[PDB]
Design an enzyme around this catalytic site. Sequence first.
Site: not given
Lengths: 246, 246
Positions: A8, A10, A93, A95, A163, A169, A209, A228, A230-231
Site C-alpha cells: 500500500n 498510500k 482502510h 485512513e 488493522e 500512532g 506496522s 498489507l 505501508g511505509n
Amino acid sequence: RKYFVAANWKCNGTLESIKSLTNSFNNLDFDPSKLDVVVFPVSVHYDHTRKLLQSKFSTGIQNVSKFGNGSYTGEVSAEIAKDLNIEYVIIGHFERRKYFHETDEDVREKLQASLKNNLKAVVAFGESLEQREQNKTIEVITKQVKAFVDLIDNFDNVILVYEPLWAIGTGKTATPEQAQLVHKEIRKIVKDTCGEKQANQIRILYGGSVNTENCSSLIQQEDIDGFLVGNASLKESFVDIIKSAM
Amino acid sequence: RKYFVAANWKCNGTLESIKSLTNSFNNLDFDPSKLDVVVFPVSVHYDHTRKLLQSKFSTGIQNVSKFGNGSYTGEVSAEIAKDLNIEYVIIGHFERRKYFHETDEDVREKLQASLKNNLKAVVAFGESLEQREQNKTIEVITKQVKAFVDLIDNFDNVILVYEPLWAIGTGKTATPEQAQLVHKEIRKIVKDTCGEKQANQIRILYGGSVNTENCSSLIQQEDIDGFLVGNASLKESFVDIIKSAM
C-alpha cells in the site's frame, strides 16, 4: 492457503521514484502461483506502475466508489475498474474511515459493487485504543466483519486485513502472539457466518506496522496469511518482506 | 478576459468511448492562446485521455487532496499532480459537498495545497432551492467565496464556478439573465475582498445545465466567462459548445 503480500504505497510517489522502485522489485525471482504479490499505487500512477512491473506482480487501487457510473464527480466506479482490468481494490482502510467518514455501510456497498464487477477485494477493519481498553475488541471486530462478510461469493477473491488501530500512532505495539489471537477469532467469525471450509480458505492479513525485521515472526503464525504493508513497501528492501512468504 | 470552456466527465467512460470522443474533439481547430479548453477525465483515465487529446486541450482531475504526501490511502496530492504535469483541479463541486461531506474548510485546504504546488484551480459554490426561496442567495455565496478567496494571488490561475443548486433536479430552470445577476454579484464580492483589477481579471463560469441550445445565450452575458459542462460534455456535439465561446 496461498500467502498474500501487498504494498500500500498510500499517497506517495513520483514517475521517477516508481521507475526506480519497480526495477528493484522486478529483480526478485518468485513464482506467482506460489504466492500473491500485489502493488497498490495512487490512481494516477496505475498505468505507469502496471507497465513498469512484470506480469508476476498483481496490481490494484487504494479505493473504489460505492456508486456506479454517473454524476459522481471525483469517483472511480467498479465498472470503470473492470474495463481497465484493475484486478484488486482496497476497501475500508482506517485512513478512509478516519478522514473521510467511511462507514460500515459504505464498506458493504463498495464490496458489493466490486464483486458485481468481478474485482478482487482487500477489506480492512480494526479497533481503536479506547475500544480495546474498554474490552470491546471482539464486539467491534464482529460488527465490522458482519457488515460485509455475507456478501463473499468466492473465498480466494476476498482478502481480510486486521488493522490494530490501538497500536498505530499511540506508542503501543502489537506482538505476533496478540495478532495471531485476533486472526484466529476473525477466522472463527467467518466460520460461523459463511462455513468451515470457507473460513479455512480465506486469507487474513496483518495490517499494522510491518518491516523486514518483524515480518517473519508475523507470517509464521498459523492464522496470519500475509500483510498489507505501508511505509516499508516504498523501499527496495520490500523484496525481503516478500521473501518471508517464499 | 480569456474565455474558459470545461468538460467535467464525472464518473463516466471506457477506453473505447474516450478514444472515439477525443478524436472528435481533436477535429476542432481553435487557438489555445486565445481560448482555454479543459477536459476533466476520471483519475484512472487521465493518462489515456492526455495521450489522445491534442495539447491545445488542457487537462485536469475532478478532485485533489487536502493533505500532502503521506499516509492518506486513496488520495491524490497536489504534489503528485504537479509531478505528472496535471494542470487543473476541480474543487468544491456540489456532488462532493453532498455525497462526501466536503466543507468550506476542506475547500480552503485543497486550494492552498493546489496553489502551493502551482496548480490552477476551478472552484465551485452555489445555493440550494431552500436558501434561494428564503432570499439567502448573496448571504450563502458570500460565505462560500470568503472561505477561500484570500488565498488567491494569481487571478488568472483561479477560476470560479457558480452552481445553481436551486435549478438542479428541482424542476426549476435558471435563465441566462438570472445567472448573470449572480455572476455580477460574485465579481463585486471579489472586488471588495481582493480589488478592482483582480475582480476584472478573474473568470466566473456558469456550472448549471449547459447544452448546445443555451450556451450562446449564456456566454453573451457580460459576467459569464464560460462553462463547466456535465452531461453534454460526454457528447461529440460538445465542440459546438466550445464554438459558442469562439
